[PDB]
Amino acid sequence: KKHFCDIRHLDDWAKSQLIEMLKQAAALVITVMYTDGSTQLGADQTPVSSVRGIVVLVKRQAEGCGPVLEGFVSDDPCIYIQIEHSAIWDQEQEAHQQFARNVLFQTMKCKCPVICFNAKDFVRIVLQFFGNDGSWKHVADFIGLDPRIAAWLIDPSDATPSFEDLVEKYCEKSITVKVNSTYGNSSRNIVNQNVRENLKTLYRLTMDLCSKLKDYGLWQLFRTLELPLIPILAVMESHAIQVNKEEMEKTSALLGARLKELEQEAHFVAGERFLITSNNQLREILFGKLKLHLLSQRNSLPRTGLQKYPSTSEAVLNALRDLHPLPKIILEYRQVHKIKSTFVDGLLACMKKGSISSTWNQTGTVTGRLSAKHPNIQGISKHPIQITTPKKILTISPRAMFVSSKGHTFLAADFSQIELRILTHLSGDPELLKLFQRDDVFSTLTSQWKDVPVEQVTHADREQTKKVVYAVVYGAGKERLAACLGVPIQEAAQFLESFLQKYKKIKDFARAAIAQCHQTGCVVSIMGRRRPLPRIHAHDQQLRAQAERQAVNFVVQGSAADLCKLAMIHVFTAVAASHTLTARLVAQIHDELLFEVEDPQIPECAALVRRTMESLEQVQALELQLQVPLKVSLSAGRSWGHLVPLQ
DNA sequence: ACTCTGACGCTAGG
DNA sequence: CCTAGCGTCAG
């Protein structure tokens, strides 16, 4: 009515008054309206249509004086800002765009609370709307209150609740919302009225969720760590990483050829034509037909079976690699198929315009880690794999596909052995704490443990030490460890308990974490992220033990996640305030930050990055203090696959 | 013919 | 331990 305004049609004095209102507002409540018109308020999770505009409820008083008559608007008014392009571009569109950008920037820099249901989407839309006028540094300081993220911090198990869900759950009480109205199942007036009402309700819900966050002790985490990350993710989604289409296209062909060769060999040695991609048929061949479990390697496999017959898993197959020529073939086939199918064919399916951009999910996991999708840049092969060309030696690197846009170079910052250091901090183990006080830590760990001083003793042990380290880090077991490393259950158990009896504190830390869980009913990371595990109270001992394992794992994994997010935020903030530095965060591989930076700026930024990241050891606030320093490894290069170390 | 869905399995990243 | 993504297969 008078509560809904198109800012294009405001008189200019009213435009000025509007800007002043946005400056003096108590709270801003924002949702994105699509062409339906639907909203971020549900229940559709991904809009099949595109963005029409942004609706902003301007609250002149926040629930948690004196009358004002503005006269061009009522109290409290909803303003509408058109994002969508028109059919014809001209000067008037330029003008409209100018005022719109001014308003949206006022939304970005305002001193009041800004509540948006999905904040990253909104920030991204605004970021693309600014275009030329603005850079990513404009939105760096934006803090939206995202109720979804709050509800995620409370109950991490459910990643994607709708708005109507959250209202029912955390809103007290009896509030009904109609979020489903669109043009064509109803009028505008209905859509708009419901938008206003639902925006008010959104404010209510957000405030409730904030207080609950304060109750559960999650507030400082929410504000300090989760919220400042939103514009960072939005910026990463607003930038595309160039990739080679030509190269992939070829390689795909090559890998296809090799795959057929391998399929032919497999059918040859198996003694029949089966489905090379079917694990069931291979399961029947290896075991029902060739009967290899029964043969020399009996009980090498997990049991005579996991059930009747063992699995086709790489452990089982590696146990059989001497018995028959098939397992090796299946393995190489799996490797090549993985690379081609996912790292090339799928990466070709993602790209637009010589480049790809991953979608980031903050509420994605229960450990507090980020997840990346379509394509998952966190799951890209680290080590280049070698194949024998069909028709010389052929080398293939998936990470070599991602190249910087000259003139720019990639700058990668890795947290060295961060899980182990977090574990040291938590356990407070004397020997591990002695270990870090610089040069190739895992080797020195291998020596200190094995009491063998070999300068760089066996690489295989370097791998064994790592494998048992992670066997205990993600806890725990004799069986699973055994599966990782190629040795029998007893040997794995002895390796494990040797390690745990060399460092006593770790067992004590684990026991303490389990004790905490059962007591509270959840477990807590360093910065206060909580992982509820009700099955810790379960009478079933398998469930109980599983909950214990999860409890032990979440402390380490979640703490590492906290530190990575913190580093992300601190570096982003550090760069965002520079006269000079253009370095842009491109992606985060969990413990590795990947930047694209201007070629000349390399020494200046690499300084800033390492300085910023290493100082994360001591920070207030929160009362964060680490028992062990954080070593940061820097590298640079024109391609992601090839990065030459720096300093 | 065609496309979905959901249970199950493997492997890469950490 | 926990992700994304690629497979089969039956309905």
Tell how many helices (H) and how many strands (E) occur in chain A: 22, 21
* DSSP-assigned beta bridge partners for residue A524: A530
Q: Are A562 and A368 in contact (CB under 8 A)?
A: yes
- Strand C contacted by A364 CB (< 7 A): yes
Is the distance between the Cβ of A375 and the closest atom of strand C smaller than 7 Å?
yes
Phi/psi-derived region of residue A528, left when phi > 0, alpha when psi is between -120 and 50, beta in every other case: left
| Residue A512 belongs to domain with CATH number | 1.10.150.20
Residues 6+ apart with CB under 8 A from A606: A411, A634, A636, A646, A647
Measured torsion, CA atoms of residues A463, A469, A472, A474, in degrees rounded to the nearest 10:
-80
Cβ of A446 < 7 Å from strand C?
A: no
**Is residue A177 within 8 Å of A167, Cβ to Cβ?**
yes
Q: Tokens standing for A407?
A: 């003139």
Measure, in angstroms, how far nucleotide B2 C1' is from residue A349 CA.
22
Rounded Cα distance between A457 and A448, Å, is: 12
Nucleotide with the nearest C1' to A361 CA? C3
| Partners of residue A592 on adjacent β-strands | A414, A589
Number of neighbours of residue A152 by Cβ within 10 angstroms: 24
Paired with A632 in beta bridges are A415
Place of tokens 């067992």: A507
What are the CA-CA distances from residue A498 to residues A86, A450, A468, A490, A493 (Å)?
Answer: 70, 10, 10, 12, 8
Handedness of CA A32, A34, A40, A46 (dihedral sign): negative
- Length of chain A equals 647
A259/A485 Cα distance (integer angstroms): 27
User: How far is Cα A509 from Cα A504, in angstroms, rounded to an integer?
Assistant: 9
Distance, in Å, from the CA atom of A55 to the CA atom of A74, rounded to the nearest integer, reads 15
Is A137 (CB) below 7 Å from strand B? no
Q: How far apart are CA A543 and CA A534, in angstroms?
A: 10
Strands (E), A11-134: 27-34, 51-59, 78-82, 114-116
Element (H, E) at A149: helix A147-154
- Chain B bases closer than 7 A to any CB of the protein: 9-14
Q: Which nucleotide is nearest to A473 (CA to C1')?
A: C1
Contact A372, A358 (CB under 8 A): yes
Q: CA A24, C1' B6: Å apart? A: 52
For residue A495, give both structure tokens: 């390796």
Amino acid A501 reads Q
Residue A83 neighbours by CB under 8 Å, 6+ apart: A51, A52, A53, A54, A125, A129
Would you say A635 and A643 are in contact if contact means Cβ atoms under 8 Å apart? Answer: yes
Asked if the Cβ of residue A219 lies within 7 A of any atom of strand C, the reply is no
Q: Are A3 and A77 in contact (CB under 8 A)?
A: yes
**Considering only CA atoms, which of A312, A219, A198 is closest in space to residue A266?**
A312
Vertex A596: Cα angle to A415 and A227 (nearest 5): 65
CA of A316 to C1' of B9 (A): 14
| Virtual torsion, Cα A85, A89, A92, A96, nearest 10 deg | 20
Distance A280 CA to B7 C1' (A): 14
Tell me the DSSP string of A556-618. Answer: HHHHHHHHHHHHHHHHHHHHHS-SS---EEEEEETTEEEEEEEGGGHHHHHHHHHHHHHGGGE
**And the tokens for A630?**
């954080």
- Cα–Cα distance between A45 and A159 in angstroms, integer? 12
**Which nucleotide across the nucleic acid strands is nearest to A564, CA versus C1'?**
B14
> Which nucleotide lies at the shortest CA–C1' distance from A371?
C3
Q: Can you spell out the DSSP letters for A225-288? A: IITTHHHHHHHHHT--EEB-HHHHHHHHHHHHHHHHHHHHHHHHHHTS---TT-HHHHHIIIII
Nearest of A156, A146, A118 to residue A210 by alpha carbon: A146
Distances (CA, A) of A510 to A101, A170, A286, A464: 53, 34, 40, 22
User: In angstroms, how far is B13 C1' from A379 CA?
Assistant: 4
Residue A30's contacts (CB-CB under 8 Å, 6 or more residues apart) are: A54, A55, A56, A57, A107, A114, A115, A116, A122, A144, A199
Chain A 580-619, CB < 7 Å to strand B? 589-592
CB atoms within 10 A of CB A507: 16
Q: H/E/C letters for each residue in A412-480?
A: EEEECCHHHHHHHHHHCCHHHHHHCCCCCHHHHHHHHHHCCCCCCCCHHHHHHHHHHHHHHHCCCCCHH
Nucleotide with smallest C1' distance to residue A475 CA: C1
Place of tokens 């398998």: A542
Would you say the C-alpha torsion A26, A32, A38, A43 has a positive or negative sign? negative
Closest residue (CA) to C1' of nucleotide B11 is A338
Three-class DSSP category at A92? helix
Gap between the Cα atoms of A482 and A489, Å rounded: 5
Cα A301 to its chain centre, rounded Å, is 35
Q: Find the Å distance, CA of residue A254 to C1' of nucleotide B9.
A: 27
Residues A99/A7, Cβ–Cβ less than 8 Å: yes
Long-range CB contacts (within 8 A, 24+) of A306-315: A309/A283, A311/A283, A312/A279, A312/A282, A312/A283, A312/A286, A313/A483, A315/A483, A315/A484, A315/A486
| CA dist., res. A219 & res. A226, Å (int) | 10
Distance measured from the CA of protein residue A305 to the C1' of nucleotide C11, in angstroms: 29
| Residue A277: nearest nucleotide (C-alpha to C1') | C7
DSSP character at residue A222: I
Give the whole-angstrom CA distance, residue A25 versus residue A110. Answer: 8
How many CB atoms are closer than 10 A to CB A578?
A: 14
Q: Which residues contact A3 (CB under 8 A, 6 or more apart)?
A: A73, A74, A76, A77, A78, A196
User: Using an 8 Å Cβ cutoff, are A130 and A81 in contact?
Assistant: no
Structural method: X-ray
Region for residue A403 given its phi and psi (left: phi exceeds 0; alpha: psi -120 to 50; beta: otherwise): beta
Whole-angstrom distance, CA of residue A49 vs CA of residue A38: 9
The protein footprint on chain C, as nucleotides within 7 A of a CB, is 1-9
Pair type for strands A114-116 and A144-145:
parallel
Give the CA-to-C1' distance from A67 to C1 in angstroms.
58
Spatial distance from the CA of A448 to the C1' of B5 (Å): 53
Dihedral of CA atoms A304, A308, A309, A311 in degrees, nearest 10, equals: -100
Q: Which nucleotide is nearest to A550 (CA to C1')?
A: C1
Contacts of A593 (CB under 8 A, 6+ apart): A412, A413, A567, A568, A571, A585, A609, A613
C1’ C1 / CA A188, Å: 49
Give me A383's structure tokens. 């080590």
* A376 CA, B11 C1': Å apart: 14
Among A478, A442, A480, CA closest to A461: A442
Domain carrying residue A472: 418-561
What are the structure tokens assigned to A388, written together? Answer: 């024998």
CB < 7 A to strand C: residues 247-276, chain A: 275
Helix H or strand E segment including A524 = strand A522-524
The first and second tokens of residue A124, run together, are 């991204």
* Whole-number Å distance between alpha carbons of A28 and A18: 13
Q: In the structure encoding, which two tokens stand for residue A428, read together?
A: 């407070």
